[PDB]
């Protein structure tokens, strides 16, 4: 998988209400309100369960307990991939690199971290 440009600081993100924010300024509320406004999308907590920094070069595999039942989910993203932890900004498997490429305040992604994900409903 390749890195997405939008995480780059100074990037402007269009919210639910058409409002414009720079990626480095997005807070939690911004996602919540943005979701409560959208009639299509819904927010879903994706607590981390396992970070088996796995397989190949600099990539990682993360498992989440999604849904109100703790569905066992998996994902495969580069270690520097950012996650928006509830009320604690972004986080990652390699905070140092994340914060090098995108120049964003990256906390260490640990098990237990309740993340933000989207889904339809």
């Amino acid at each position: 998988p390749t890195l997405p440009p939008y995480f780059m600081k100074g990037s402007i993100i269009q919210l639910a209400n058409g409002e414009l924010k720079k990626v480095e300024d997005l807070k939690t509320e911004d996602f919540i309100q943005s979701a409560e406004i959208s009639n299509d999308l819904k927010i879903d907590s994706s607590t981390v369960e396992r970070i088996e920094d796995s397989h190949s070069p600099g990539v990682a595999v993360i498992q989440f307990a999604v849904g109100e039942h703790r569905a066992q989910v998996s994902v495969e993203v580069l270690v520097e991939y950012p996650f928006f932890v509830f009320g604690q900004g972004w986080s990652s498997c390699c905070p140092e690199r994340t914060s090098q490429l995108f120049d964003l305040p990256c906390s260490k992604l640990s098990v237990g971290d309740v993340c933000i994900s989207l889904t339809l409903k």
Binding site: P4, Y6, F7, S11, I12, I13, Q14, L15, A16, L20, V23, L26, D30, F31, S34, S38, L41, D44, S46, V66, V73, V75, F83, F84, C115, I116, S117, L118, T119, L120
Partner: peptide, 25 residues
């Protein structure tokens, strides 16, 4: 006094919030 009629805008490449987060499904 005069209103600014022929005012061209500035184009800014923007990104959708929903794109910055993993979509589950």
């Amino acid at each position: 006094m005069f209103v600014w009629t022929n005012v061209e805008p500035r184009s800014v490449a923007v990104f959708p919030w929903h794109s910055l987060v993993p979509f589950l499904a």
